[PDB]
Structure formats: structure tokens, C-alpha cells
Design a protein around this ligand. Sequence first.
Ligand SMILES: *[C@@H]1O[C@H](CO)[C@@H](O[C@@]2(O)O[C@H](CO)[C@@H](O)[C@H](O)[C@H]2NC(C)=O)[C@H](O)[C@H]1NC(C)=O
Ligand SMILES: *[C@@H]1O[C@H](CO)[C@@H](O)[C@H](O)[C@H]1NC(C)=O
Ligand SMILES: *[C@@H]1O[C@H](CO)[C@@H](O)[C@H](O)[C@H]1NC(C)=O
Ligand SMILES: *[C@@H]1O[C@H](CO)[C@@H](O)[C@H](O)[C@H]1NC(C)=O
Ligand SMILES: *[C@@H]1O[C@H](CO)[C@@H](O)[C@H](O)[C@H]1NC(C)=O
Ligand SMILES: *[C@@H]1O[C@H](CO)[C@@H](O)[C@H](O)[C@H]1NC(C)=O
Ligand SMILES: *[C@@H]1O[C@H](CO)[C@@H](O)[C@H](O)[C@H]1NC(C)=O
Ligand SMILES: *[C@@H]1O[C@H](CO)[C@@H](O)[C@H](O)[C@H]1NC(C)=O
Ligand SMILES: [Zn+2]
Ligand SMILES: [Zn+2]
Lengths: 497, 497
Amino acid sequence: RFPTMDEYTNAREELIGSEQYLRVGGSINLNNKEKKLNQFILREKRAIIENSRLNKTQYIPAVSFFLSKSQMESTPIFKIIKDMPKGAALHLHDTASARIDWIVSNATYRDHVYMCMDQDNFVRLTVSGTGPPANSGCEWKLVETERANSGDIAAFDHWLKSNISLLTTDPLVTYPSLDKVWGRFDKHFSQLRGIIYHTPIRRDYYRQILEEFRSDNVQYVEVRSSLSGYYDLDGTVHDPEYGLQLYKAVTEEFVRTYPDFSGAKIIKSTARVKPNTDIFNDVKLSMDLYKRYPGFFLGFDLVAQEDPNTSLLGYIDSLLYPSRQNPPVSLPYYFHAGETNWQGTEVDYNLVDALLLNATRIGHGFALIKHPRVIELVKSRGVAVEVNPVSNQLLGLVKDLRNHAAAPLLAQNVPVVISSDDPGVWEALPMSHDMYVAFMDLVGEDAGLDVLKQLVWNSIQYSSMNATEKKTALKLLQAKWNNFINDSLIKWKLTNK
Amino acid sequence: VRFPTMDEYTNAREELIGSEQYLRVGGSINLNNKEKKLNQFILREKRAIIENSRLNKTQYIPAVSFFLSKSQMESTPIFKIIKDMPKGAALHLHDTASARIDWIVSNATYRDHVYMCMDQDNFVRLTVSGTGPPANSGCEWKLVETERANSGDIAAFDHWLKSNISLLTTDPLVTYPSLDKVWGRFDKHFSQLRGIIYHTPIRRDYYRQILEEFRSDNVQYVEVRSSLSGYYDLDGTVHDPEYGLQLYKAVTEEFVRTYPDFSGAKIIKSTARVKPNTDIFNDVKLSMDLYKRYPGFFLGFDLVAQEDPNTSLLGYIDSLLYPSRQNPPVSLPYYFHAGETNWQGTEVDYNLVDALLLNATRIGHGFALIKHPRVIELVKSRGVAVEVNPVSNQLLGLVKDLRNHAAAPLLAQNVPVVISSDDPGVWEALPMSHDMYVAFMDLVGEDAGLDVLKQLVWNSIQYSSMNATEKKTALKLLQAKWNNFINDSLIKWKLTN
Ligand SMILES: *[C@@H]1O[C@H](CO)[C@@H](O[C@@]2(O)O[C@H](CO)[C@@H](O)[C@H](O)[C@H]2NC(C)=O)[C@H](O)[C@H]1NC(C)=O
Ligand SMILES: *[C@@H]1O[C@H](CO)[C@@H](O)[C@H](O)[C@H]1NC(C)=O
Ligand SMILES: *[C@@H]1O[C@H](CO)[C@@H](O)[C@H](O)[C@H]1NC(C)=O
Ligand SMILES: *[C@@H]1O[C@H](CO)[C@@H](O)[C@H](O)[C@H]1NC(C)=O
Ligand SMILES: *[C@@H]1O[C@H](CO)[C@@H](O)[C@H](O)[C@H]1NC(C)=O
Ligand SMILES: *[C@@H]1O[C@H](CO)[C@@H](O)[C@H](O)[C@H]1NC(C)=O
Ligand SMILES: *[C@@H]1O[C@H](CO)[C@@H](O)[C@H](O)[C@H]1NC(C)=O
Ligand SMILES: *[C@@H]1O[C@H](CO)[C@@H](O)[C@H](O)[C@H]1NC(C)=O
Ligand SMILES: [Zn+2]
Ligand SMILES: [Zn+2]
């Protein structure tokens, strides 16, 4: 009943307003300084969207990261997000979270590093103190010699980087299927496995994760790591507790050096390709490290490609073992779950088992929007979904990022944290690229700084810090946020707006 | 301990999965024993194709471009069962795009006074002129009869005409790899046929071919969008919209009298949303008048043409609110295309808010609906069926992998949905069987079978605009066709025992 345009406007704005309040960040009340920055962001967002829509050209924030990376980095919204404190990156893999450039310019300049071209014509890297490795399907050569004989060291080093990065070409073009791009992604890890498991390189690589994340204004990380098998020049192989202690010592020194950094905690990950009887041992291992490293060791996760490998149900007696002890042991789980386009299959039904197993957070949950009951359990229990949008695009779940299945989750205020997954593999920053695409593609044109602030706060509030640590971290984050707001008003000439 | 045994765990697991099954489209259907026999065969076939794709790591063909999947699906049991299955109704169709290009070629371009030219973009155009060739405005018109006779190869000439008009000659996802490019090609298709298909005897016979083709795909009823206006005779006489409506009414009545196994057709007036508000106002008043004087054949009004770059519903709001604001009010039903977009928080997807505030009877596409939880509530509460056209949404740029189709989460929440084909003539689809196949294989899960199909089929009659008497009669008819389909299928697939 709209006799005049005012009654129609009022009902229209009431319904739209209800959705805006319901979505992520909708209950935030911005202060006056925040509002001025918010209005600039919203003007910028409308300008790029309206140009795409009305001038009938592609929306760059939603195309392949290969194409959009160099375009977004010059824009004001990206520069604001780059400067913004992120809080925490809660979904990361320890052999994929520092720069390939550091592997090349630092690790492959160390003594005793070898390279070979494998039968698929990819370079592999490893360390051997005890002579060159055996020619098992590839001929190892000392990198120092190959580089010194290249006749162009800059080109040699660039070739190493180009042969290892997944962003050398557009993966959506070069590996145009799920199985092809996962073939390339699995190959990347095989290329670096040898060098990245040598103990002093692994130690320093982990330190580089912390340096790079701090440099992108991330103050805290939770990292998945397999922990085991770091090896020395003399061939000594270390156990998982040693690997955990190695990370603990690096983290403590880093936080000593940088008290503006909250620190790190570690999740043990095992590949879901192994027999149940081996997963059982890794569950027992995790129960032990959880008891003896409280507050640094968080719990357990299963990784490797979800679709063709073993389901959570395929491991259910291992995963139920802690809860079944007398007295029960509660081993926290952080399951990767539902990282798939399938529906009604044992892959997306991993989400059901993740909830039945009391997962603390869920990795990806791309299939979650197809499961209305699992959504309601996730919301009612406060189980944060770790959303990694660049990863999901480049690794084959979606092409146009406005079709990312987390957008309907955010619209319902499902608890979500943004993370980068494997940023080093495809040359992403620790958080700013993923936060930009989440901001530009997974929420709407009228969604501004309140969404960003809520996602940032979510990454601490749904971290696995204890309550006291969260309060301390939020105090530090609030000071970072206030500086970011003031700096941004000056930088974007908004102060009198 | 919550799950001390496997039976305690599977009990909880199956109750949770079962409760989601009860909540999706078709989840309340109880199949009888014959239907269960066919359902078990369908589910075995569905599991075989999905598990092969998943475990043998190869593309899921039902979800790839229609250009690639069409020939592969047609040889499979599931497609052949859907082909035989009664579809109920196609509720979302456009009258100049719902019969075969082959008929335009083999019938329409063999008629007297048909001319062709190559336009400046190098596409063939077709028109009719009773007074010699038309003015050569931007192309040189030639008589088709002469060109065909001088072609030197008549079959190749006719095949070339078809190949120059169809969007499935090449894969649109490859040849027109952006929204603007493929909508450019799509707009061009209509320009190519516009002249010939607005000539009155051709337009009449083409509309008859829509009814014959849909009947042949076991569709018993259609509701069709039509602009209704501008049909023209050999001597240049141009008819008004009421004449177009009467012409369709006569063709429909003759068809139903010939084929009692066919329920019939009703018409929705469409206007392109590139026009000034003064034009839409005139077409709203025309629709008010046709609704009053052709009850039960003229249904109401819709706005068409590409949604993203053109005028919003709010841009016409004074015209659209005019019927309700009369004294006494006149209730002009609306069937708005709405939210056919990847945009979020913009003028375009917010058309969904206005469509509901204006009391739409059904909404076309609603691709953006899953991003609008408060609109979803109204759609469910009011029983506003969403017309889902999956092949159209893929080929015209909203999605690549159809498992990412935004209607899959709608179906999982039991949003009222009907499947339709939109413009099947344009890209060589069947009236319903291809779209029902991709909906069944991509938009619901591995464990969703004959109950989903049956519900979608019943929905298309239940959410039609038939009156109470017609609907009861049509549902008895549909039940009869369905029983014959189940019995025939048990024999054909050798499922009886
Ligand atoms: C990794 O490095 C390979 C060795 O250079 C490279 O091999 C070829 O394909 O690269 C050239 C094209 O860039 C081509 O001219 C050479 O003939 C190839 N070299 C050999 C020894 O076969 C691979 O393509 C690189 N792979 C990636 C993914 O970058
Ligand atoms: C929509 O329908 C309601 C309920 O029938 C009615 O009261 C209202 O006037 C209608 N509004 C319009 C704009 O037609
Ligand atoms: C479209 O582009 C032109 C120039 O290329 C520009 O003037 C115009 O404002 C653009 N429109 C929008 C809405 O950005
Ligand atoms: C690599 O990093 C280490 C430790 O961070 C540093 O001492 C060294 O200078 C760098 N380069 C190499 C080749 O070791
Ligand atoms: C899950 O959590 C609930 C409440 O926290 C607890 O009672 C239950 O036993 C837990 N289940 C498992 C499998 O650990
Ligand atoms: C995978 O393909 C092989 C043939 O190469 C076949 O034997 C096997 O059954 C397939 N597996 C599945 C799960 O379809
Ligand atoms: C075209 O269809 C019309 C109308 O049914 C029919 O009379 C005519 O014979 C057809 N032309 C051809 C070549 O079949
Ligand atoms: C249409 O025909 C012309 C002339 O043969 C040809 O060059 C052109 O590529 C064709 N276009 C399409 C889209 O098939
Ligand atoms: Zn991960
Ligand atoms: Zn349509």
C-alpha cells in the first residue's frame, strides 16, 4: 500500500536495511573518523562497480588473480586494505606461506643445495651434505655450479622462480581443470620438499613467514605444519616434537624482537592419503603434544586434496579415540572440510562429521551453503569458517569470485575469518590480496569499512587464543586500528570531509 | 562419552543428513514401489558418473559448457529417462526464441519475399519485403531464393544460415569470453531474426511450432513472454498488441482442440527495459486493459532485455505502482525477471526487493537471491516461484561450472522453484529436457533422485497461473502421464522382476 513514493521508499529501505543489519558487521557503529574513511571507500567501490556495469567491461576484482593482482595494487581500496591491521591469519600451511623469492635468493644460495629436472620437466631442489643425491629419475647438479656457469645469474634466478610459482602463467588457462591444476599444485610441493625440510632452511623459512605476515600488518598467525622429518646436513632426521620446539623458539624470539606482534600457535596436519592405522598414531601424537605444549600446540587437521582422498568418516575411529578415553581427552580439530563443488557426496558430507567431531574452526566450507542444517549448527555453536578466496579460485572451485560460496554465508552472518592458505605458492601477500577480493567480491557495493572491521575482529575473536590472550591482542589491535584510521584520513585527504 | 560406539555415531550422522534430505525440494515425497525401482536405477547411474569423475580425477561433464555436454548427455540413461519424463510446464520462455532455428531455415527462409544481407559485423540478417528489396541502410539486401539457387550447394547454404544464427555453432564460453561479449552475440541473434520473425504469417506459424516442439518434449503447458506488438503483413500493415494476443489465442485454442493431452498456454506481455518510462507507462496501461478483457489468457507484465546495464524496476516505479494506485485499485500481476546478475548490493540485484514489494507472482532467475536472506523469506512465505533457467545462466555469463549455480542453495532450502529453458531455440536446446538434466545433475546432490524430478515437475503446474479448475484438470493429466512414464520406464530399462 504505497499511495505516495515516501511509503514505498520506507518499506524498501526497511527491507534493505534489515539485510544490511543482518550481514557480517551489520551491528557495528562506526565513529566519526571511521565514517569519513567509510564514505571514501564506498565512493571508490561504487565508481569501479558502476564503471564495470554501465560501461560493460569486466569486473577486475573478480577475474583470475593472475590478471587482477597487478591491477588492484594501484587502487585506493587496495592501498587502504594493505595499510589496515588484519588481526590474524588463521588458515596457513607452513611450507607455503613465505616468498618463493626467498627460497631462490636465500635458500638456493646456501651450501650443498642441489637441483634436477624431473621427468615432468620441473626443477626440484634438495640439500645433501653427504655427496650428490642418487640419480633416481633425475640427475642432481650442484646449484652453485649451475648458477656460476649460467652466463646470466639474474635470468637463472628468475627461471628458478618462474619454474616454481603457480602465477608464472594464469593457472585458469594453463591448467584448465581441477585435476590439472591440482597436478600442478602437488608438483610445486614436490619441487620444494627436499630443500624446505632441511632443518636450518625450515627454521629460517618459518621465521620469514612471521616477518612477512608482520610486514602486511598481521599480528598473529595459526599455522598448519606436519612438524616431522626435518633433517640436518649429516643426515639426522628429527621427530615432530623437535619440529614443534623449533617453531616455538623462533616464535618466542620474534615476539621478543617485535612486541607489537602477538605471536603464533601451531596445528598438526597429516595428509589424508595415509592408512587409518597411521592416522591413529598421529592422533595419539597430537594428544601428547596438546597436553605437554598447552597454548602453543592447538590440535589436529587432515590435509591434501579433499575430493579424491579419504573422508573424515574413513578415519572416524581414530578421530573419536580421544573422546572415548577414560577420562576423555578433548583434542581440538581444525578440519579442512567441504573444499569441493560436489553435493550429496562423501566429500561435502565431511562437513557433517566435522560438526559431529566438534571442530573448533572449519577450513573452507565451500559446500556449506548447500547444507542448511550444518549452517545452523555452525552459527549456533560459533564455529568460524576459514575462507580463502584466492586459493578457491586458482585451485578450481570457482572462476568469477562473485560466485564464491562464502558470499551467502556472510550475508547470513555465519562466523567467517579471511585467510590466504598458500600465499607463497602463487605470489600473494599474507592477507591483503585475499582481504581485498573478499571485500570486493564476497560482499556488496553498499558494504564498507564495517565489514572489514568485523572480519578483522573475527580473526582474533575466533582465534584459539585463550580469553586473557584475546583481550591483550584486542587492546593491541585497537591501537593499530586507531593509528590506521588517523593515518588514512591524512593520506587520502579526508580530514575535513 | 557422546559416541562410545559406531552405532551411536551413525545414528546421529544419519539423523542429521536425513533431516537435510527432508528439507530440500522433493524431500517430503514418498515414492511407491514402482517409483522406487526406477529411483534405484537412477541413483546407481548418478553415483557411477559422479564417482568416476571424483575418483578417476576427470571433469564432471554434466557441469561443463553446454556446447561440450549436449552430445555426451544425450547417450546416457539418465538423460533418456528425463527425455521420456512428463515435464509439466515450461513457465519461463520468450516467444521469439523457443522454436528451432532449423525451422526458421527450412520453412521460413523458403517463403516468398524473404531477403538476406550481411551486416557490418559480418552476420546474416533476414527480413520480409513485399515491395522489392528493402532500402540498403547498412547492408545490401538480396532475395534468399536467388542466393540459395546461386549458392552451388543448397544443403551447405542452409547449414551456413543455421550456423550463422545459432549461439551453439561454437562454444560461447570460448568465442565470447565475457558478459559483454556474449550478450553482444545474444543481442545480435535477435537482430538477425527480427525482420523475418515479425512477419505475421511467419510469427503465427513459429508460435505454433513452439507448441508442437514443447508437446514433443512431453511438456503439456507453457507460459510465454511476448512483446505482442509490431507483427506486419506483406503489404506493410503493422498490427497492434491486442491483435498479436488474439493471434496467439487462436493458435493456442486450435492446438488444444487437436491435442487434448496438452493443457495449453497463457501469455505474459514483456517490454524491453531500455525504453523511456513513458513507453513502459503505456505498456502498463495496455496490460491493465488486456488483463481485464482477456482473463485466463493474458497474465500480466514483465520487463526484459539485459538486466545489468539497463533500467532498474525502481526506475519505472511510478508506472509499476500506477495500477495499485487507481480508485478502485487494479491488480496487474507481475512476472519480473529479477536478479539475473552476479552483482551484489547494486541497483540490479536490488530489483529483487522491488519485485517482491510489487507482489510479483513469479520471479525470473533470481540468480542473486541466495545473497538476500530477507527476500528469501518473502519468496518462501508468499509462494513466489523462482524460474530457474540453468543453461541460459551458464551460456550468458553468470556461471561456468553449473555446480556453482546459485539456485542449488535455493533448492536445498526448499525455495519454490520451477525449471525452464528461457531461449532454447537460440542455442539448440530441447524445450525442457536439457535444462532438467543439468538441474538434476548439477543443482542437487548425488543422493537426490526421482523425488527431486517429480517435485520440480509438479511445481511447474502448481506454480503456473492456471485457475483452480484448470489446475485440478492439469494435475490429473500429469498424474496419468507420470504413471505411464513409470511403467514404460520399468520395462525399457529392464527393472521389473
Ligand atoms: C620449467 O623449466 C623448464 C626447463 O627450462 C621449461 O622447459 C621448457 O619447456 O621451456 C621452454 C619454454 O619456456 C622451452 O623452449 C624449452 O624447450 C623447454 N625446456 C626443456 C628442457 O624441455 C618448462 O616449461 C618450465 N615449466 C614451467 C611450468 O615453467
Ligand atoms: C500487494 O499485495 C498486498 C496483499 O494482497 C496488498 O495489500 C497490496 O496492496 C499489494 N501491493 C501492490 C503494490 O500491489
Ligand atoms: C564510462 O566511461 C566513460 C569514459 O570511458 C566515463 O566518462 C563514464 O563516466 C563511465 N561511466 C561510469 C558509470 O563510470
Ligand atoms: C639467509 O638468511 C639467513 C638467516 O636469516 C642470513 O644469515 C643470510 O645472510 C641469508 N642468505 C643466505 C644465503 O644464507
Ligand atoms: C562435543 O562437545 C560437547 C559439548 O561441548 C560434549 O559434551 C561432547 O561430548 C563432545 N563430543 C565429542 C565427539 O567430542
Ligand atoms: C576409473 O576408471 C577405470 C577405468 O580406467 C574403471 O575401472 C573404474 O571403475 C573407475 N573408477 C570409478 C570409481 O568409476
Ligand atoms: C511451412 O509451414 C507452413 C505452416 O504449417 C506449411 O504450410 C508449409 O508447407 C511449410 N513449408 C515447408 C517448406 O514445409
Ligand atoms: C557468419 O557468416 C560469415 C560469412 O560467411 C562468416 O565470415 C562469419 O564468421 C559467420 N559468423 C558466425 C558467428 O558464424
Ligand atoms: Zn588449507
Ligand atoms: Zn527470460
